[PDB]
Amino acid sequence: SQDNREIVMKYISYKLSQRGYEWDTESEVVHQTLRQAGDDFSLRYRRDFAEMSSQLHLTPGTAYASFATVVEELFRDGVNWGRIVAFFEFGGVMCVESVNREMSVLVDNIAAWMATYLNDHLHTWIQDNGGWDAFVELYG
Ligand SMILES: C[N+](C)(CC[C@H](CSc1ccccc1)Nc1ccc(S(=O)(=O)NC(=O)c2ccc(N3CCN(Cc4ccccc4-c4ccc(Cl)cc4)CC3)cc2)cc1[N+](=O)[O-])CC(=O)O
Numbered sequence: 001s002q003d004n005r006e007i008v009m010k011y012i013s014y015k016l017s018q019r020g021y022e023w024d025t026e027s028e029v030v031h032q033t034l035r036q037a038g039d040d041f042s043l044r045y046r047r048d049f050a051e052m053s054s055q056l057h058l059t060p061g062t063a064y065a066s067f068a069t070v071v072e073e074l075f076r077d078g079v080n081w082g083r084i085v086a087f088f089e090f091g092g093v094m095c096v097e098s099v100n101r102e103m104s105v106l107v108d109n110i111a112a113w114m115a116t117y118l119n120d121h122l123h124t125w126i127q128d129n130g131g132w133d134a135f136v137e138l139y140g
Pocket residue numbers: 036037038040041042044045048049052070071073074080081082083085086087089090093138139140
């Protein structure tokens with residue numbers, strides 16, 4: 001019912017489309033509110049966005065460790081919607097950088113990592129905080 005997998009796929013498709021790359025359930029109201037919040041996050045936290053984009057040194061064998069290290073740091077002091085939006089933007093940076101560095105094979109892997117983290121680690125918090133509808137109530 002949270003449909004976190006399709007939320008991830010639609011989000012990553014949008015991020016890759018913004019950079020000119022074509023790649024591969026909840027209301028459009030949720031999908032559009034999330035992508036607008038993520039665009040706004042990265043224009044508000046531009047230095048952070050740019051630093052993350054620059055300092056990722058992706059290879060296939062180390063990309064998961066990069067993902068897991070950053071996500072643990074992001075949620076170390078707990079979960080809030082803003083950090084969830086930052087998590088989506090981070091996955092979008094990892095996907096775009098993968099395509100830029102001729103490692104496009106990583107995009108489907110990163111999408112799986114994101115869906116899995118939502119389902120296994122953020123699911124309880126999302127349900128307890130009123131689901132994706134509550135995200136829209138606050139930030140739509
Ligand atoms: C106009 N619009 C769209 C405004 C939407 C509004 C502002 S946009 C925004 C702002 C902050 C977070 C997300 C979106 N949204 C918002 C505002 C506050 C909040 S909130 O819950 O009070 N949280 C915060 O304000 C917040 C602010 C900053 C946050 N980060 C967390 C990430 N951190 C860098 C970082 C640290 C550790 C690990 C990774 C990173 C990192 C992660 C990703 C990248 Cl690309 C780069 C670095 C930088 C600071 C995290 C949360 C949440 C949202 N939201 O979820 O959409 C509708 C409206 O009017 O409400």
